[PDB]
Structure formats: structure tokens, C-alpha cells
Design a protein around this ligand. Structure first.
Ligand SMILES: Nc1nc2c(ncn2[C@@H]2O[C@H](COP(=O)(O)OP(=O)(O)O)[C@@H](O)[C@H]2O)c(=O)[nH]1
Ligand SMILES: c1ccc2c(Cc3nc4cnccc4[nH]3)c[nH]c2c1
Ligand SMILES: [Mg+2]
Length: 170
């Protein structure tokens, strides 16, 4: 089969994980998507000439059993760590996601991309400079997106695939 990349989208409720995923997969903006639904989605794409499958888990937070969270973190090859630019707590929550994914994978080298969503809003509490400083501390890429206009969307997912390839070649 063609290569499949298992991507996981994490971050606080309300940041735009579902909207980002649906924009990536279906090329439309979805206004209201029940915040409690967690599902996986697939798309066949071409990234830098490679025809591959993206298999994306749109997470929704606590699970019935914490074992289920540990399971999808071990399964997942790369993580989009999403905050919203107008929600400071969602940015502070990134430190928790960064640590928990490393912890469950028992790894210091986990492909990740920091995503600041909702860039289309003028309302902003997290300045690009402060998100860049966080991503520099982690040594990972940072991309500002808008699931509403689709700006940055393919970059965020495709950049995570590229990070996974750099991990796999070691
Ligand atoms: N303006 C704007 N609103 C967005 C964007 N992404 C998501 N939203 C809205 O933010 C709310 C939460 O989005 P949702 O995808 O359900 O977030 P999730 O809980 O992380 O899955 C919804 O009302 C979305 O329409 C964006 O890029 N720009
Ligand atoms: C990354 C990590 C796990 C999965 C899976 C397995 C899976 N894990 C799940 C947890 N909750 C709801 C649905 C779920 N499906 C499918 N695509 C993935 C991408
Ligand atoms: Mg959601």
C-alpha cells in the first residue's frame, strides 16, 4: 500500500481542531461541530511528489478510559498542537500536550508542529513572537492558520508529514 501517515490533532476545546481537519479533508469551513465528537478521517494526497494517505485523528479530550488516550498517542506518528490566537489558556495548555505526548511515547523525538489557529480574527491575545519563542524552545515548526479562509492549512498538515519523514530517516 502507499505510505500512510498517522497524524493526531490535539489542543483545548474550541481551538479549531475539527474545523482544521474538515478544511483539510473536505475543503469546507464547518461553523459548528459538536465539541465532544472524536473521529478519524482519511485523505489521499501528494506531498512533494509522494502519493500518500493522511489518517488523521481529530481528538476531543478525555476518553472513556485513559488507556484510549495512551493508545492513540502511541499509534500517532506526528501531532498538530493547536491553540487559538485569541485564547491565552489554549496556548498555555500546549505545554501540557507537549509533555503528555512525550511521556506516553516515552520519547524525546516526537514529530510535532505548533499551530496558532483563527488568524483571520483581529482579536488576538497570543502574539506571533511569543508562539515563535515556544516553537524555538521545542525545535519544531510554527504555523498560523485559519480554518475559515484555509490559510496555512495544507502547510500545517504537510509540514507535519515532512517532520515525520525526518524522524523516520534516522
Ligand atoms: N474565525 C474562525 N473561527 C474558527 C476557526 N476555526 C474554528 N473556528 C470556530 O471556532 C469554534 C470551535 O471550532 P471547532 O473546530 O469545533 O474546535 P475544536 O473544539 O478544537 O474541534 C467554532 O465556532 C468554529 O467555527 C478559524 O480559523 N477562524
Ligand atoms: C492517529 C492515531 C490513531 C488513529 C486511528 C485509531 C483510532 N483511535 C481513535 C480514538 N477515538 C476515536 C476514533 C479512533 N480511531 C485512526 N486514525 C488514527 C490516526
Ligand atoms: Mg472538535
Amino acid at each position: 500500500g502507499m505510505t500512510e501517515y498517522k497524524l493526531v490533532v490535539v489542543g483545548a476545546g474550541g481551538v479549531g481542531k475539527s474545523a482544521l481537519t474538515i478544511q483539510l479533508i473536505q475543503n469546507h469551513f464547518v461553523d459548528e461541530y459538536d465539541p465532544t465528537i472524536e473521529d478519524s478521517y482519511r485523505k489521499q494526497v501528494v506531498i512533494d511528489g509522494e502519493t500518500c494517505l493522511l489518517d488523521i485523528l481529530d481528538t476531543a479530550g478525555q476518553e472513556e478510559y485513559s488507556a484510549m488516550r495512551d493508545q492513540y498517542m502511541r499509534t500517532g506518528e506526528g501531532f498538530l498542537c493547536v491553540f487559538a490566537i485569541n485564547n491565552t489558556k489554549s496556548f498555555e495548555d500546549i505545554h501540557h500536550y507537549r509533555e503528555q505526548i512525550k511521556r506516553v511515547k516515552d520519547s524525546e523525538d516526537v514529530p510535532m508542529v505548533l499551530v496558532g489557529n483563527k488568524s483571520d480574527l483581529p482579536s488576538r491575545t497570543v502574539d506571533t513572537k511569543q508562539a515563535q519563542d515556544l516553537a524555538r524552545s521545542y525545535g519544531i515548526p510554527f504555523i498560523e492558520t485559519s480554518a475559515k479562509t484555509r490559510q496555512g492549512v495544507d502547510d500545517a498538515f504537510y509540514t507535519l508529514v515532512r517532520e515525520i519523514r525526518k524522524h523516520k530517516e534516522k
